[PDB]
């Protein structure tokens, strides 16, 4: 189906403790496949997925140069941002960058992204047209004017429609055994007595990939959104994800409750009950 490639950059200043740290991670869908860390003993792009290890020395060298240059650029950006918000040199600040492309089954570009946050808040984003920017505040308007003057969006667009899509196609080809494989959730319902008159029903979803899943409880066929406790989807450490949803049920009324599971690895949605 649809696939995405995303790079996530984090630069963090640390006055008194050296220059800002730059770290990048790269993902295809929910699979991390590269990292770079300026705090590494010998900073270099490193493989984090089996299917990327086949790339030649040229790949790692080129990308490593790109990350080191980007780390320097980010240090300059952090200085500028400090200025834009009238901040001193004493505090620590964070610049995050997130960009990449979404393609369909035929590998054609569906959507490009290229955006930024400062100290956790949206700062500036390339619009869906890949030709203009949306600035979150008057500081980001300075960045916007600068990038308009420099026709920066054209470079971003050139990457997103060109190299981004082609590299994603390549990765999908080389890692297809994993990247093009949906692992369905393994599901069960557990029962936990709370008191003489009440018990918890917990619906489990384990071992699924990708992370996107819908997990709901119904009582008499009616959604229980407000009375359902639903934990965030969490990584198992083996590429797969986990999630559960729980409801508190009156004793004896257990069979009126159904758990509903939707996942792309499931041809049709599951319906589960206690036992």
């Amino acid at each position: 189906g649809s696939h995405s490639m995303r790079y996530f950059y984090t630069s963090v200043s640390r006055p008194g403790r050296g220059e800002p740290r730059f770290i990048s991670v790269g993902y295809v869908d929910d699979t991390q496949f590269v990292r770079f860390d300026s705090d590494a003993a010998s900073p270099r792009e490193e493989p984090r997925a089996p299917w990327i290890e086949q790339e030649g020395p040229e790949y790692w060298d080129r990308n490593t140069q790109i990350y080191k240059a980007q780390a320097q650029t980010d240090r300059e950006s952090l200085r500028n941002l400090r200025g834009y918000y009238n901040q001193s040199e004493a505090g620590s600040h964070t610049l995050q960058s997130m960009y990449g492309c979404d393609v369909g089954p035929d590998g054609r570009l569906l959507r490009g992204h290229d955006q930024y946050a400062y100290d956790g808040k949206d700062y500036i984003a390339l619009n869906e047209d890949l030709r203009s920017w949306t600035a979150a505040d008057t500081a980001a308007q300075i960045t916007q004017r600068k990038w308009e003057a420099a026709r920066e969006a054209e470079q971003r667009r050139a990457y997103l429609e060109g190299e981004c899509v082609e590299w994603l196609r390549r990765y999908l080809e080389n890692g297809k055994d994993k990247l093009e494989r949906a692992d369905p959730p393994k599901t069960h319902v557990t029962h936990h007595p709370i008191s003489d008159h009440e018990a918890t029903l917990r619906c489990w979803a384990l071992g699924f990939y990708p992370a996107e899943i819908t997990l709901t409880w119904q009582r008499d066929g009616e959604d229980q959104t407000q009375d359902t406790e639903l934990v965030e989807t969490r990584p198992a450490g083996d590429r797969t994800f986990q999630k559960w949803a729980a409801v508190v049920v009156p004793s004896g009324e257990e069979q009126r409750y159904t758990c509903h599971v939707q996942h792309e690895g499931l041809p049709k949605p599951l319906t589960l009950r206690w036992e």
């Binding site: 790109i66 960045t143 420099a150 470079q155």
Partner: peptide, 13 residues
């Protein structure tokens, strides 16, 4: 692969 700095004195914020 990451986007390279072909510009390149203007890609900063």
């Amino acid at each position: 692969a990451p986007r390279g700095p072909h510009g390149g004195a203007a890609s900063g914020l």
